[PDB]
Amino acid sequence: AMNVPFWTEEHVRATLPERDAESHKGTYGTALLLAGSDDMPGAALLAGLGAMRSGLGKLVIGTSENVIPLIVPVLPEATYWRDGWKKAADAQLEETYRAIAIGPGLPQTESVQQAVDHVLTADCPVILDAGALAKRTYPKREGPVILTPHPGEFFRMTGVPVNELQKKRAEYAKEWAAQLQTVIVLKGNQTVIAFPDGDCWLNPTGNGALAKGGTGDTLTGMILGMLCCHEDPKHAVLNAVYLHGACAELWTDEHSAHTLLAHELSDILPRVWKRFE
Amino acid sequence: AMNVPFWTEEHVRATLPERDAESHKGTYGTALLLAGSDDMPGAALLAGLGAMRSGLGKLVIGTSENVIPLIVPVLPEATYWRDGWKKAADAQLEETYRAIAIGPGLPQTESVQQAVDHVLTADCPVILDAGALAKRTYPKREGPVILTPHPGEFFRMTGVPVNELQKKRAEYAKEWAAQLQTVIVLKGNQTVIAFPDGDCWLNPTGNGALAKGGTGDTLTGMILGMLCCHEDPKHAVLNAVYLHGACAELWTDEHSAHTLLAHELSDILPRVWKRFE
């Protein structure tokens, strides 16, 4: 209806970063992932894997103490801020991060919102997902704030019921990205990527293999890592959403769309990303 | 003897569901798996993997607290109801699930039966396996009840000794499916799928690679997930049993039948399912 353009292969190819011979991990920065709780621990592993796969230099995972041991054998390259998402409720971050994501596997509580407020005083891009998504406003700051709601969370954020949202996805995503002055990645088939400056795109990749628990946690991590290796955070978000969907498409070439497990998206991304280089 | 027909490839191909571009995980529903105990923890992982592989939208695993950490690194896409199979002994389920399975890795106790009674008040299809299999009757309810006994459990349920059962497998499975008004998946070579309306089929797939611990826990999960993505729960059960056996057959093309580990069935299913699309 609004003729929102697709973020195409040609756009991905033109904007994906190089990883130079002369580079060191500091070039690609340290990300912080605030995720995973005692009954939703897996989100931390999914987002962690997505993030380390996606071109950062280092990852610190601020997860609950009991979640840490569940991540290490699979992703031994991450380090930890013990109970970090809880600690973030109480004070400003003291360390500097290239990008921060908060919310996968966190409960929808006021303490999580207090952590969100403290994280927003950092200068870097910040992603809010899952439990960190609420009906709220956002303070003027330097770096972008990137909200990644599925339609139900969009309802939680805006009061737009899902049946209404789905009739006019881009129009609502653009309106609320403008109102909130946040990026909104509105999930679904033809995911909408709406920017607060009015730019908006649709994602052309993906399929129903993604319609299963965990694939959004993986996407949050992919965005987090891409924010670390792209100079332009807009391109980071767009490329993450694109490549995430492209991994599901590779999967369905030889596997049934009913059978994908989200973590596998992260196993697929290395080969998929190569093809766009 | 009763000329029970085989559930053939043509029947599988005709009944397996599509996963549409327009679908979201809610289309495919949330399953509940009540499984895994302190000395039989592995059943929860096996059934969990089978279920998430088999086309559901979300999985909640109600397992013992100490089992949770054993699942997460392998299946980070599941979420948890802490001590859920124990809690289910005490009250009705408050949440709505598309399908429920109970029993893999649970002890054969009265408390497990109390959980079975509470789960049966939900409206959805319910699978009973392993520890949840007992000599008992079942209340009239909407959704099917699906019993998945091996011959020894069939003896436990009915008093038909195994040596007698095995002479007349389909005849006993049909008689007891009718008597109990439950589906009975009577395991073994040429697994019998007997419906309480008198329909009955034999499964043509599988081999002795399946004759090892854990392959039935995997099947329970496969049924659970297929109940979530098939409109017709009869087809869900039939296709699960079929594809489960078909995975063992793929395995023996290049691997010895002595050497399969059950979890691998779940690794194989993505490619096997593709071939029937």
Place this chain on the structure above:
Amino acid sequence: AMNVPFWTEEHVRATLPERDAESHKGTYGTALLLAGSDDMPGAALLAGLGAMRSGLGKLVIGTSENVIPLIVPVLPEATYWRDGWKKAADAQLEETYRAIAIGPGLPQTESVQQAVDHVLTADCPVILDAGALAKRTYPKREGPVILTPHPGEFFRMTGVPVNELQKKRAEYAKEWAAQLQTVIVLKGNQTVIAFPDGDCWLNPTGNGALAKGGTGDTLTGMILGMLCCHEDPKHAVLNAVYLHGACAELWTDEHSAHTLLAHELSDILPRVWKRFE
């Protein structure tokens, strides 16, 4: 010197068992593995994997309580006898097993020997390895007792120093198999398989990829599982030793012999075993 014959491919091909369509896991039996302690936990996982890969029907692992959680995510098909190797010091086994292995990852203590004495009152074949190897004698019983020493353990058992042993491997292995009335699998290049009835063979397979921690724990498990699916326990031992070495040879076709990790032997065995069918 004694012209001990090699257990050749032709002998393996002639003696490896079928896994019939009509079989059920009870045909292949339940094995017991008594292994793994707090500072040597990994032996339980290695032997467990070897055993479940090698044609048994079920595996019970009697390991230390803290070891259990380390096995489950990798080998969810095993079930547990909590603190079983310790409990076995105190009383006779109450359950019937097709075969029992004791020792990988256990300390060389008198309590382990007390467990060995209790296990020997069962009727089945029993394997003793690692910590269960000591200077001792063995009671007359039905089933074979299979000792699997490396040269250092052979010294511990017999007082024959390693430098002397290695000059006359088969002669010492045969002499002590006769004296003790046990099978002795004397490890090394050209592993000796000496039977107490005077039969003796050399193993022709394997290479220096096996000269690393854990490969013997894996072999113990392989013997354990093969004792469950072979009618003739002599053939079980011979085939296990052979196929174990054959897996190392497959590995070195495309990988450096310096780089094998023992658990991988178990990943390789499915394809290797197929080729001998």
Place this chain on the structure above:
Amino acid sequence: AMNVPFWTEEHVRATLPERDAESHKGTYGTALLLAGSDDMPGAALLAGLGAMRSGLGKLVIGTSENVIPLIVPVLPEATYWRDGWKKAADAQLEETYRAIAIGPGLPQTESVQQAVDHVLTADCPVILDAGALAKRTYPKREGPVILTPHPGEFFRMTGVPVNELQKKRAEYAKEWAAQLQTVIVLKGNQTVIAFPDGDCWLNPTGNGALAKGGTGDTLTGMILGMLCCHEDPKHAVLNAVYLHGACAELWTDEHSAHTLLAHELSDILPRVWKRFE
């Protein structure tokens, strides 16, 4: 500027060791890895995997008690010295090791330095990395001491600021290897391998896929294992650095350089090492 030669393929091919049919694990020795702490546990797994992959006979990991369970399911071939890096602060090592590495995942504390002093009284080669790197001097002893700093750690050790170091990498590495009488592996593109006898080489392999957390922990382990299977420890260090970089190059043939996870280097090494045989 100093015309430091590259350690080339021809040099690797000429110096890599054989793994003879007649060898036993004692030929290849027991390594000790003192690594991994509660908030940096993953370094122990990464270095452990690197070391066991790299031709040793046995590995003992002296890690924190809570780290042990995180390693076992992935690397069940290692055994443990419980809280070993902490215990090493208090007394001389009682056991003999072929090589020792200390530091990955350890804090930069005085107690770690006390462990370093105790480890240096052993006769064998010793690697110091990460937390074990400090501004200090080293006692005359038999075996080489191998420091593996990235530029920031080199600054910590020497006071040479990173911006200055990077202009004259080999000149500074050679000067300080001479001053300290240690080997210095100065990490980065064209890693410098400076020996205290004045020999110096550059490493020609690797790429920016290595510019991510954990790849240096993996290298520490690779050096540790290669010190066990090379007679000449100089060649061990050179070959480790070379093959480590060569694994990143294999990865980028079909995968994006942004996407490598360090542990995968260890999965790649078996095939890469084969090609240099």
